[PDB]
Design a binder for these strands. Structure first.
Lengths: 49, 71
RNA sequence: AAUAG
DNA sequence: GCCATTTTCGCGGCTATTTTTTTACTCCCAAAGTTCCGCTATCAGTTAGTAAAAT
């Protein structure tokens, strides 16, 4: 998403970090979004909508 | 805490599905059942109950707490 | 432009 | 070459609040650069399905 960075990145160069795997990076991104969507850790960010 | 739904407990997919199959909608409902109900829940494995009781220990609650005037 | 102080 | 007279130059209080303006007008053509719709083709993202694993 480009947070604290100059540029945004696609799945390829994010895979280039440690393991170059588009399907894996996609899965871990989905997991992160699912955990951030839990109401336990999203009430703070809900107020900005 | 008691009025909070079970979806605030950060349960797994199978654990949440089993609790929904048992029609448990609030934390007070879950903490009023002990192993008498949970261990007899269909599809609910052995490690699942360990996970649930660990979560409740994290939240400072346990199973089968006797609460009056619920709901 | 006009009006208020 | 200094003494006086005429000519420019710049100035003339501070805060508010009500509200637009308006004349004057060749045409055509060939050549050139730009746009707008449609189609293609590639890549990346999303989604559905199925096997792998775990309970």
């Amino acid at each position: 998403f480009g947070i604290d960075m100059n540029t945004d990145h696609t799945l390829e160069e994010v895979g280039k970090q440690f393991d170059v795997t588009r399907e894996r990076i996609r899965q871990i991104e989905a997991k992160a979004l699912r955990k951030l969507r839990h109401p336990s850790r999203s009430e703070v960010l809900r107020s900005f909508l | 805490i008691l009025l909070r739904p079970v979806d605030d407990l950060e349960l797994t997919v199978r654990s949440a599905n089993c609790l929904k199959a048992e029609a448990i909608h609030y934390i007070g409902d879950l903490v009023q059942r002990t192993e008498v109900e949970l261990l007899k829940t269909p599809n609910l494995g052995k490690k699942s109950l360990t996970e649930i009781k660990d979560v409740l220990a994290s939240r400072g609650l346990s199973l089968g707490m006797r609460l009056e005037n619920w709901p």
